[PDB]
A paper describes a structure:
The final MsPrsA structure contains residues from Arg9 to Gly316, with no electron density observed for the first eight amino-acids and for the stretch Arg204-Lys213. A Matthews parameter and a solvent fraction of 2.11 Å Da-1 and 41.76%, respectively, were calculated indicating the presence of three protein subunits in the asymmetric unit. Each domain consists of an ɑ/β fold built on a central five-stranded parallel β-sheet surrounded by four ɑ-helices with the N-terminal domain (residues Thr139-Phe146) containing an additional 310 helix. In all the subunits of MsPrsA one molecule of acetate (ACT) sits in the phosphate binding pocket of the ribose-5-phosphate binding site and makes specific contacts with residues defining the R5P binding loop (amino-acids Asp230-Thr238). While the R5P binding site does not reveal any significant peculiarity in MsPrsA and is confirmed as highly structurally conserved, significant differences are observed in the case of the ATP binding compared to the human ortholog.
The M. tuberculosis PrsA (MtPrsA) catalyzes the Mg2+-dependent conversion of ribose 5-phosphate (R5P) to PRPP using ATP, and is the solely enzyme responsible for PRPP synthesis in MTB. In this context, we report the structural and biochemical characterization of the PrsA enzyme from M. smegmatis (MsPrsA; 87% identity with MtPrsA), that is the first X-ray crystal structure of a mycobacterial PrsA ever determined.
Residue numbers in the entry:
A (entry chain A), B (entry chain B), C (entry chain C), D (entry chain C), E (entry chain B), F (entry chain A): 10 to 204, 214 to 316
The structure:
């Protein structure tokens, strides 16, 4: 048994942090783009017989990084790797996990099928948009949660406060309920959208923990902060696993009232996306523990 | 039986030309990008029971357009399309059709597998880098040739000349041999590369038809023009199916001695890629005839 | 002392502008071509004892105009002109000022020798491709700069903007640095080419001043515009001294994103080379001042 | 000692003929134009230590080819060629070899100076407009004559005839006298122009050999044919070394009464300049012998 | 009433063109020369009672064609022609229309008297050197103008240009004034000769229409082109009714800078007089309309 | 009264001989041709009040010399000459003195009318083709005869011989009869042509004097010599006033049997027309006597 770690080019800090935790160097490779956009991949040491972990994050532009991961998995399959696990800290197309009105694809299911066809035996991901995505892949899917990590941090710094957990929309109330339990059985509230916006529950004078899976443009979340403010909240804290933080989100979030915005580094948080209220916690130790347990295999 | 033509956003002029030749409208759809880079696709009329032809060209950035095509195919499969044919005028990753002595992927094979998994029943392509790519897909693959189109044009305008067909490298000599036959049994030459460059055959005082499958950066082809020039060629004409024309190729080709450069519009030839010696012929009539024959059991 | 101004046929508007600033008529001469291409030159008034300034621009076809200037200088030398200054607003063959790793001519040095052999005592030029070309001639070389003229214009119209000076390649960074100083000590960036293209420096949200010595086909410069666009530039302004503007450059520049393209009239900017974003500033006042100072001779 | 033959692009057939006679390949080189008109030259094999012969003919457009020859000589000088001979079968600007009563250049003398400055050690030319041009260059000038070649041909085909040698103007009478001696001491006549035209000498019933150095537009020579016709000449034969043959000369000469027009191939005689009475003799054997003798150097 | 068209031998293409426009055949006749030079004329069908039009152009040698016309008129007078009109598209001896300060003939008047004595009742001519020649003949003289024809052609092809009409000498300014009016009221200039040459008026940057009644040797007109060129004219177009084009005029005009030379076919333009800038318009339709009106009492 | 002698350029020896006999210089004039063929005439001393004699011979090309004479007469008429006599030693168009079949001119009458219209008061000619031409001119016509001159010479050298006068055709028998009387009443013969040739009269063993007005091509006269030879003539002598001697006549007459050919110099007998049997007698003394008698005027 031989553990080998491979990494795409999208998020080099995460790869380096994971490699350090495991005490294993990232496997040498040439990874480059033709002017075309076609990706070229070549492994610069032997991969025959290894237990391979292929780590790729999927920031913008996302389709390029998804193809790079599939190409690496093809190469390991043709190079006689024994077992291939794909690690996708942010699962691409997770939001497209059903048809909605219809005549649509289920893109999250297509991603799992493509990873299977490329040669992946296992998928590891963090905080899927829905837990049912775990059933999209014909094989083991380790669905890691950042909840303990995020609530542990919030518990260390806001234990003194009078807390209410708030879900920014109706889809996320169940997870919010899990957080409220983790924070000592505090109350719960959420934003009801009629197709107007209303807060359902009492937040007056309370420290609100606004929890979401991801922050993309910051529209929904900034709207929620302003609503909670209007309803007499003392404080608002934003916590999410994935900081996609596109477009005006950094500016939007810095200018909204929130005291703190807490994210993990499943995606690379570049200097353009940073702002003073932003705190980034590392997902690396969680990823390293999962790789170790998969590799140890009992 | 109902013919429906779907098109991605990469090359709208080709889609419009094909639609005109068939006398059918392109099917209405919403195709847009989240800031993330994730593609959203929705069909705005019914697609149940149709014979679908999904046309997507693959210019830079290529991996985005490949995912868009796969997503459209997933949607047609879940929308109960009867038969799905993928049309890829320029086949992405065609150059990566073997390992080149390890440890590499066979990306051209991966593309065919991903198209199969998405739900494609047939692939149609024009002038594959190698003919053996036809065997990469478990199903019908119509491999269309632009040879008649390109040699017909050269025959109209250079019948008066004393011609030699020249292959810019050892890989393309067989196709070059076919062109020489089409042009009335004229002589043949090619550039031999030792790992220096040498012309093998007599070109002195002749009008050279330099033929390639594609022009990417123009490095190999410009080198060949200069070599033929040094060996006393009266003129040089460049003909290729695919104008990828990345980077300095336009400057490079315009500045090299070539009298004419002839390409098809399998890829969109934007105004940045244009130059005075450049001629673009339409591949649309050929694509329309192939679709009609596939559709009509012709 | 008697000032006489002679002009070739290549760029009559510049000659007329310079003549007007000096209040001196252009000296009468017969300048015509045999069918052969041989140039015939004859002066139609006396030139004995004059301080002669021979003005010739060098647009396409360039070698003809170079020979016309050499022939005029020979005639002035045999007609007993006292002092002969050659004015070459765009110095022909300036790009060929070194060997580029053999086996090449140094054509810029050949031009200076030929002008010396013909009888020229001085050379006047505007924004040489490299400053070292001044050492190629055994005698005075007045190297005039359009920098103040171009940055003055940019200062009047874009002072409100948040500027970065950008060099389109590694060769021009020093001149770009001079411009940044002229524009109030603004930041600096340049395009790095690995032998892929990358912008080095931050341009996100800034108004980019892309500076080059000349624009020929517009390939490199259009490429740089697109790269800056991709990196989140608000605006791009193109500024260059010499508008050679051959081939597709007018169409290429008009359809790239640039808000303005600023050149001088060292070369004639014909109506085929014009487009809406194009601004042409006159080099005539600068040339007239230099002639006056040379003529006044203290 | 190593003989190397370099050729410009103006007259490839002559270069190929000369190369064949010597049994030496033309040296490989890249010779191409920027859109500007600037010529780029590079030698593709070593030239260090060679005896170089740089062959360039000077058809329309002439100044371009003159610059190409100067540029090649500069490159050989900087590439450490041992000895450089310029071969100019038709000497450009030979007609401008004096002032013609002022204020004109002596362009033929300028050409020799420019060739010297570029690095030429020798000049080889064929039938200079005046023999004194040999003194314009500070160094060896081999002035080759086509007289034996042309009178040899006329002797084989018109020995039976009753011949008079006729000069089309007062400037060429001495050379005409040399021809009359070569043809067996036949009589002499010439066209006298008063500033009306008159033939001086008896041509009635005789076969006239009209001799000139070159034929350009064919105006003077066609005029002379008609004058000789009016004076009762049986036949007129035109013989000249250089067939410049611009404009209407081919049509003019074909429709004037002349039975034959004999030229050499010092200039390229393209298919547009051909007509039935035209005979072209090769100058190549003469050029190859001269190169060999210069190279052998005793 | 019976229309009969007779033609001399000088200009057969004009006679055929006129005959076609009228839909009449040229009357059969024997016209031949004794070795002496005496002309023999005989009509080979009846001419009694006809309205005769005797068409003769007067190229070199001119006195022969004048006698032929007089002889034909004598024969028609003795053959009982009812009315005889002489058509002389180029009026011979028109330049000798006054004594020029003695002791000279008035040859233009003599020509009219000789035509009257031979039996002519009318004279028709095109663009007489002076309009007063109309008074030299005791009878009707239809003086036709080619102005509309020449300015119509110039208007079609140079309407886009910024025009000035230029007279090559002081004698033609009035006609030049008429042309400027026809061309839309454009400015006027002319060449002043002191007995030096000077342009009077502004031509700088303008397209000059140099207009004359005839071009003979091309001396005056070539001089004018060079003068306009020296005064900064963008271009020069030459237009004249009569192309006499003797001697070196073709060489002279082709070598001067003029972009176009436009003439009519009042004289036969043989292949020796042709050159590339030369355009010939037919005077036949104008002649046919005049004959029809004279014949029809129109 | 003041005698002035003017001469055209056709026959300068005759003019000089006549001038010498009269002791009067030929009046100075400029007489030249434009390339056109138009003649320019100017008198270089005063002609007012003179008795003018305008001497012109009319060799080939004849119409030019006829126009020159008419132009000179016009000039004398406008220069106030008192009396103008035209001298035409050979009267042009004399052979066309009637219509023959018809639809012909009477060109001899047209010549007289043109001379009258030009301003001539008198015509002097030698040996008109028919004596009735004297009635074609409305005024004095001095018709001079060379008969005494020619028979006087024949009497000096052939008195010893047994003579018969022979007319070469039926038209000339009367003049031949006059000669026979002048030679002492010798017999007469002539050639009868049937429309075959026959001699009518006895010439056997006799010295034949073949007499004609002129010799043109020599066809008729050579035919007559051969016929007389066949009929047993001892000798044949040819005598004619006018030696036109065109074409092969010199060769024809030299090769026919004739012992002597006697002509006058009414036309210039150039060296091409000379042969050994040819004798030329001067008409000058006869012309000088006629001028003197006209001038003396009683």
């Amino acid at each position: 048994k031989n553990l080998m770690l491979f990494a795409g080019r999208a998020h080099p800090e995460l790869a380096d942090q994971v490699a350090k935790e495991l005490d294993v160097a990232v496997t040498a490779q040439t990874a480059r783009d033709f002017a075309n956009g076609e990706i070229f991949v070549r492994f610069d040491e032997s991969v025959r017989g290894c237990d391979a972990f292929v780590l790729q994050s999927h920031p913008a532009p996302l389709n390029q990084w998804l193809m790079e991961q599939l190409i690496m998995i093809d190469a390991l399959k043709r190079g006689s790797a024994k077992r291939i696990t794909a690690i996708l800290p942010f699962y691409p197309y997770a939001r497209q996990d059903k048809k909605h009105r219809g005549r649509e694809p289920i893109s999250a299911r297509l991603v799992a099928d493509l990873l299977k066809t490329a040669g992946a035996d296992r998928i590891v991901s963090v905080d899927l948009h829905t837990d049912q995505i775990q059933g999209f892949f014909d094989g083991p899917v380790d669905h890691m949660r950042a909840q303990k990590l995020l609530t542990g941090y919030i518990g260390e710094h806001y234990a003194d406060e009078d807390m209410v957990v708030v879900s920014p929309d109706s889809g996320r109330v169940r997870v919010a309920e899990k957080w409220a339990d983790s924070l000592g059985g505090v109350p719960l509230a959420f934003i009801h959208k009629t197709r107007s916006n209303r807060v359902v529950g009492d937040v007056k004078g309370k420290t609100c923990i606004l929890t979401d899976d991801m922050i993309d443009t910051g529209g929904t979340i900034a709207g929620a902060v302003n609503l909670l403010r209007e309803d007499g909240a003392k404080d608002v804290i934003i916590a999410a696993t994935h900081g996609v933080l596109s477009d005006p989100a950094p500016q939007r979030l810095a200018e909204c009232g929130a005291r703190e915005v807490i994210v993990t580094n499943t995606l690379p948080i570049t200097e353009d996306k940073r702002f003073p209220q932003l705190t980034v916690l590392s997902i690396a130790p969680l990823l390293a523990n999962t790789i170790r347990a998969v590799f140890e295999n009992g």
